[PDB]
Design a protein around this ligand. Structure first.
Ligand SMILES: CCCCCCCCCCCCCCCCCC(=O)OC[C@H](COP(=O)([O-])OCC(O)COP(=O)([O-])OC[C@@H](COC(=O)CCCCCCCCCCCCCCCCC)OC(=O)CCCCCCCCCCCCCCCCC)OC(=O)CCCCCCCCCCCCCCCCC
Ligand SMILES: CCCCCCCCCCCCCCCCCC(=O)OC[C@H](COP(=O)([O-])OCC[N+](C)(C)C)OC(=O)CCCCCCCCCCCCCCCCC
Ligand code: SF4
Ligand code: SF4
Ligand code: SF4
Lengths: 70, 176, 96, 55, 155, 297, 370
């Protein structure tokens, strides 16, 4: 009967699965764990620019905390 | 006697109009179509695995011809010429002249497949069941000339589809 | 064969690897079926060429061919009759 | 028909009808492909007497 | 090898040309019943990669089915010319391939091959559905017996 | 690095669209007492490739009357705009986190009419132009319903940011709150998708569009949950939902006769539109009536 | 094969010209040069939808001239296959209409069923279609053993298969709006346009050949034809579907009381002698010999006698020259009368719904073009 559609849809299922999968992980790879900080408004953007300038390595995704001040 | 079809007199009561309004507003006859189709989906198909399996036929099946022969190998055809006297498409051409052993049997038996109708009048017309409608049908060719049969082609198919045809005609002569 | 499967798939065939000097593999068709088994495979008879074979005669083909179309062993149509008239053969006498 | 009860109950719901009772694919209930020989009846005018063509 | 690469490419080019070719009809006469009576569930052809579709610009093989009258003769020729290359035509039925019953009548051409270059001939009056299915199978096998890129490389 | 993701957003879709054709035929197979393609590889798995591989090998028969410029440009945009459609989809974290992704989604959906119009006008055939004339009139007709429906449901989200959609649904699928609009949208996406030589690309475009529009409905109404520490759970839930919706596209495509032209517009203007107007009016008053207006930030 | 050429006052149509003739084989012209038996498969090739019913018309026609009646047994088989053709035709008629609209699934369920009765044709005659079974004098061969049980099993399950055809089309508002209020034909116009069969039945007119002038053995059977109210393409669609339901009972009534007796008239001058009788009786050889050379000589005269083919009033008008060959057989067909009113039929409606009018008209290009 119909269980033969599953091989037909499974390929598309896996094929449709990669984009969301790929975006999920390389964002972690590019941004080091945390997601790419979304900037829907000016505030989140200049928050990011302050982070990038304060990192010193010129990378927002690198975060420095209480250890950074003495 | 007869019965009407279209007339329905749909009742205009509050309950009945609710069902009609509900049917239009939240579609119900359409979802019925979905339910019927889905029920169709969860049912094993009727497709046949050709050529690994081919659909059923009958002992009376009319297919590619074959000129049969007696138990000892004699041609059953005698050129009585009844077959083309009833061949509706005049696909049969027959000539006869003397044979070596005093006989004067046939020489030409060409049933043009591209003219033949496969009605089976020839095998019924034959008084000695010489020409028959064989069970085979897988004889498609890529040349128009191939389907133009001759005496030797007919006789070869008679020797090819022999055991099958003999069993069929043994299982069908009581009906005829 | 089978009884479980519905009418039209109860009996079936897997074709050989080589038949009649022709390779039978990824390409195959229905003409490979020998004439005796064409009956049983097509449900024209319950009982197969096993149990009781059909009758035996000298003139039945020793082996069932395949469809020979498109191959060097094709069929060719030709006139089976004889030339009706013959020309007047001229004597080859020296002359006059 | 093969199909377990969960398939049968599923389609019986979607159809709303008993599909198991009568299916559209023939099964072993059909007549055997080989059948006993027939003995069809004689002609209605097969009498060899009082059967002249003039009547 | 030089011949090996063109051999692999030739197979790949025509391996599915015999499995993705999509039939085309004109559906003239009683042969137009088996035309799509094979599209019926019993003798499924959609499984064979073939599937009926008119779309004369976007089809592979046309199964000429029925009696070919002189009056329609322009229509078939204009369809076959509009047919893209590669193209094949299948003559289903005795009337289509060789006139059959009406061969002697005044308003049918004696065979389709007098009008179009005709590929595999499937006989029958009408050809019982699987006979064309067998005929279509022969056409796909004929597609394998092709040396398109091989012939080009030989030249 | 970004280039990898863009390819990783296009290639699997194209493979998925390729295998949608096998799905389109075969899920309709056993739903037809049929088997579907089973001779081309195991269970027809090679049929996606086979059709996508033989069509390109055919010569591109273009009529002389057809202008080669438009006859090529119109198919080109028919895919390219349909390929950027997939981009702002909130698959865990979307590619471009547009603050106005809904407008970006719908506006590019408004340019798919140009592929049909030009490829029909350039053909210079009486059958072709009326077909293009029919298709352009239908798609632009359902455009007004598409936007009004979106305005109604999105009002309860907070802003046109597609990334906010997941947060809005969360606990409850938003189909529960706008089911009268849900079937309104599902019929609308069917009509726009045109689904009740240089051609494999077009069929791929009109089939990628089916998956996305189904995916757009999936993210819209048939919501899900997203754990920041395991986005893969949201991935599987999302693809499964849009797969089922694509199956429904196939389910009804083999369950209905066609719509006549007059009824095609009668259904929209005289039935769908006035009902859509009321529902939009309902979906704007209600958040104000209940002090449940979502935050813009 | 249809060359519809027709005018577009914008999207609105004012006159449709159906240039039929695309399949014109001069069937009657060839019939002039064949004997009665040889001309028989031509009728078998006329309506290649309900083929055995065409044999019915030609048979009784030649029976009428010959003043020979079929044996009672053969009469009952003919109506069994006559109604199977009715099942054959209406199944094709409703679905091709639905295929023209855009409904696909009804086409394939019903065409899955079509194999079963085509398979039955194989068992009884030897061909899927073009059986050439019904001949002057009755039927050629007898029913194979067990065939009656097999058709009983198919019939006992076929009423189930009708339900879905009704369920997803009759109730579907999509099918309604695409089939109602189209091809509306008033009663007197239908009758005076020469229409036959369903157009009369659909438009409210109480008339049916199978009941008003019951031919063959339709006397004993009892059923009710479905005359409707409006007569549009939708109403005729219910008439078509209900006719399959009606045909199911007609199959039932002949099935359960099939009489015993011979399959062919005991007249060797008109029916070929039996094969066993052929090889023992000197008269049998002579009668068989000449019957397949020239055939029975039909006394002069002319008849038009028609039957209720599922297409409509199908009749053949043959003139006999007093020899063993017909002189001229005008092929009266329901389709030609059906299509004769196409100009009015498509009036007042657009292309996408007059194609539905084409579906309900049950036009097949073997009855018109011959
Ligand atoms: C989606 C739903 C869950 C998966 C499919 C479940 C399924 O098929 O259940 C069997 C069965 C199939 O339908 P049928 O007509 O009832 O089957 C009767 C015979 O047992 C069937 O008899 P049979 O002879 O067909 O049995 C052998 C069959 C047995 O097949 C199975 O058992 C199916 C699962 C194979 C793995 O296997 C084969 O034929 C071998 C070929 C397999 C083809 C490819 C299958 C791919 C499966 C998915 C792969 C990953 C994607 O369906 C059910 O039992 C009910 C529906 C499924 C419920 C699942 C649980 C919820
Ligand atoms: C406090 C509560 C406030 C809100 C309450 C709101 C009122 C209650 C609900 C109102 C009704 C529901 C909303 C409207 C829906 C119908 C609109 C309409 O015009 O209907 C009549 C219409 C037309 O019906 P008609 O043809 O009978 O004619 C109706 C009247 N005229 C002539 C004026 C149009 O119905 C349709 O269009 C049917 C569908 C046609 C398209 C074919 C595909 C259908 C697929 C169905 C299955 C899939 C469904 C998927 C659902 C989503 C899944 C995610
Ligand atoms: S096949 Fe039979 S009927 Fe025909 S010529 Fe030979 S013996 Fe006579
Ligand atoms: S079956 Fe063919 S050869 Fe035989 S009588 Fe009929 S048309 Fe002629
Ligand atoms: S070959 Fe036979 S079935 Fe086909 S069109 Fe000719 S007469 Fe009709």
């Amino acid at each position: 009967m119909w269980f033969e559609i599953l091989p037909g849809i499974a390929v598309m299922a896996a094929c449709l699965f990669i984009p969301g999968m790929a975006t999920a992980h390389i964002h972690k790879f590019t941004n080091g764990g945390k997601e790419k900080r979304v900037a829907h408004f000016s505030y989140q953007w200049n928050l990011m620019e302050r982070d990038r300038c304060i990192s010193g390595v010129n990378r927002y995704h690198v975060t420095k905390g209480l250890e950074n001040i003495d | 006697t007869y019965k009407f079809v279209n007339m329905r007199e749909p009742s205009m009561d509050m309950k009945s109009v609710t069902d009609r309004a509900a049917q239009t507003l939240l579609w119900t006859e359409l979802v019925r179509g979905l339910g019927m189709t889905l029920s169709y989906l969860f049912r094993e198909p009727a497709t046949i695995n050709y050529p690994f399996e081919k659909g059923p036929l009958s002992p009376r099946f009319r297919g590619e011809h074959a000129l049969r022969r007696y138990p000892s190998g004699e041609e059953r055809c005698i050129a009585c010429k009844l077959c083309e006297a009833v061949c509706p498409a005049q696909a049969i051409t027959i000539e006869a002249e003397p044979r070596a052993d005093g006989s004067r049997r046939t020489t030409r038996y060409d049933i043009d497949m591209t003219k033949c109708i496969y009605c089976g009048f020839c095998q019924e017309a034959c008084p000695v069941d010489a020409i028959v409608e064989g069970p085979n049908f897988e004889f498609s060719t890529e040349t128009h000339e191939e389907l133009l049969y001759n005496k030797e082609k007919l006789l070869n198919n008679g020797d090819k589809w022999e055991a099958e045809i003999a069993a069929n005609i043994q299982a069908d002569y009581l009906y005829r | 064969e089978d009884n479980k499967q519905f009418f039209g798939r109860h009996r079936w065939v897997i074709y050989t690897t080589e038949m009649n000097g022709r390779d039978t593999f990824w390409d195959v068709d229905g003409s490979m079926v020998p004439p005796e088994w064409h009956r049983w495979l097509h449900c024209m008879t319950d009982d197969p060429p096993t149990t009781k074979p059909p009758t035996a005669r000298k003139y039945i083909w020793t082996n069932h061919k395949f469809n020979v179309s498109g191959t060097p062993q094709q069929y060719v149509p030709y006139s089976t009759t004889r030339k009706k008239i013959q020309e007047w053969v001229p004597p080859s006498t020296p002359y006059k | 028909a093969s199909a377990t009860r969960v398939i049968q109950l599923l389609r019986n719901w979607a159809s709303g009808r008993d599909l198991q009772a009568k299916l559209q694919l023939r099964y072993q209930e059909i007549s055997k492909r080989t059948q006993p020989p027939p003995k069809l009846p004689v002609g209605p005018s097969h009498k060899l007497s009082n059967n002249y063509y003039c009547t | 090898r030089g011949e090996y690469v063109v051999a692999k490419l030739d197979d790949l080019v025509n391996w599915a040309r015999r499995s993705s070719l999509w039939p085309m009809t004109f559906g003239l006469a009683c042969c137009a019943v088996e035309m799509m009576h094979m599209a019926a569930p019993r003798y499924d052809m959609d499984r064979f990669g073939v599937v009926f579709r008119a779309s004369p610009r976007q089809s592979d093989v046309m199964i000429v089915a029925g009696t070919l009258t002189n009056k329609m003769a322009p229509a078939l020729r204009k369809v076959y010319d509009q047919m893209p290359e590669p193209r094949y035509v299948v003559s289903m039925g005795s009337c289509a391939n060789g006139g059959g019953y009406y061969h002697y009548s005044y308003s049918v051409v004696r065979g389709c091959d007098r009008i179009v270059p005709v590929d595999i001939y499937v006989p029958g009056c009408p050809p019982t559905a699987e006979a064309l299915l067998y005929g279509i199978l022969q056409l796909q096998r004929k597609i394998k017996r092709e040396k398109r890129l091989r012939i080009w490389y030989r030249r | 690095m970004f280039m990898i993701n863009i390819l990783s957003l296009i290639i699997p879709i194209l493979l998925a669209v390729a295998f949608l054709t096998l799905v389109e035929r075969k899920v309709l197979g056993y739903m037809q007492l049929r088997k579907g393609p089973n001779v081309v590889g195991p269970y027809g798995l090679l049929q996606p490739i086979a059709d996508a591989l033989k069509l390109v090998t055919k010569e591109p028969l273009r009529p002389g009357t057809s202008s080669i410029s438009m006859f090529i440009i119109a198919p080109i945009l028919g895919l390219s705009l349909a390929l950027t459609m997939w981009v702002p989809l909130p698959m865990p974290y979307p590619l471009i986190n547009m603050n106005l992704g809904v407008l970006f989604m719908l506006a590019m959906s408004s340019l798919a009419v140009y592929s049909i119009l030009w490829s029909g006008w350039a053909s210079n055939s009486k059958y072709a132009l009326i077909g293009a004339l029919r298709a352009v009139a239908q798609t632009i007709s359902y455009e007004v319903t598409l936007a009004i429906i979106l305005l109604s449901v999105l009002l309860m989200n907070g802003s046109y940011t597609l990334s906010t959609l997941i947060t809005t649904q969360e606990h409850i699928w938003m189909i529960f709150t706008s089911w009268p609009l849900a079937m309104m949208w599902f019929i609308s996406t069917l009509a726009e998708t045109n689904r009740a030589g240089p051609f494999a690309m077009f069929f791929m475009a009109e089939y990628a569009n089916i998956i996305m529009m189904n995916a757009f409905t999936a993210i819209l109404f048939l919501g899900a949950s997203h754990d920041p520490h395991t986005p893969e759970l949201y991935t599987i839930n999302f693809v499964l939902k849009t797969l089922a919706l694509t199956i429904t596209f196939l389910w009804i495509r083999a369950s209905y006769p066609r719509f006549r032209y007059d009824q095609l517009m009668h259904l929209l203007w005289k039935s769908f539109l006035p009902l859509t107007l009321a529902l939009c009016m309902w979906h704007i008053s209600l958040p104000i009536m209940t002090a449940s207006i979502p935050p813009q930030s | 094969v249809l060359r519809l050429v027709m005018e577009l006052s914008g999207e609105m149509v004012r006159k449709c010209d159906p240039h039929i003739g695309l399949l014109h084989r001069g069937t009657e012209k060839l019939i002039e040069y064949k004997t009665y038996l040889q001309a028989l498969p031509y009728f078998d090739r006329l309506d290649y939808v309900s083929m055995m019913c065409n044999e019915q018309a030609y048979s009784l026609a030649v029976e009428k001239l010959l003043n020979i009646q079929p044996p009672p047994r053969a009469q009952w088989i003919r109506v069994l296959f006559g109604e199977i053709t009715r099942l054959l035709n209406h199944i094709m008629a409703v679905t091709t209409h639905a295929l023209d609209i855009g409904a696909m699934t009804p086409f394939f369920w019903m065409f899955e069923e079509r194999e079963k009765m085509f398979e039955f044709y194989e068992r009884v005659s030897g061909a899927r279609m073009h059986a050439a079974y019904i001949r002057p004098g009755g039927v050629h061969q007898d029913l194979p053993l067990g065939l009656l049980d097999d058709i009983y099993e198919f019939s006992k399950n076929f009423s189930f298969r009708i339900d879905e055809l009704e369920e997803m089309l009759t109730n579907n508002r999509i099918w309604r709006n695409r089939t109602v209020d189209i091809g509306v034909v008033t009663a007197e116009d239908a009758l005076n346009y020469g229409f036959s069969g369903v157009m009369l039945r659909g438009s409210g007119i109480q008339w049916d050949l199978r009941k008003t002038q019951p031919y063959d053995v339709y006397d004993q059977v009892e059923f009710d034809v479905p005359i409707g109210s409006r007569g549009d393409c939708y109403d005729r669609y219910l008439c078509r579907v209900e006719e399959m339901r009606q045909s199911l009972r007609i199959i039932s009534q002949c099935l359960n009381k099939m009489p015993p007796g011979e399959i062919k008239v005991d007249d060797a001058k008109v029916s070929p002698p039996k094969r066993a009788e052929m090889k023992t009786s000197m008269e049998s050889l002579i009668h068989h010999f000449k019957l397949y050379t020239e055939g029975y000589q039909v006394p002069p005269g002319a008849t038009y006698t028609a039957i209720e083919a599922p297409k409509g009033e199908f009749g053949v008008y043959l003139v006999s020259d007093g020899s063993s060959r017909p002189y001229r057989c005008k092929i009266k067909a329901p389709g030609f009368a059906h299509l004769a009113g196409l100009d009015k039929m498509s009036k007042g409606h657009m292309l996408a719904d007059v194609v539905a009018i084409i579906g309900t008209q049950d036009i097949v290009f073997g009855e018109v073009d011959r």
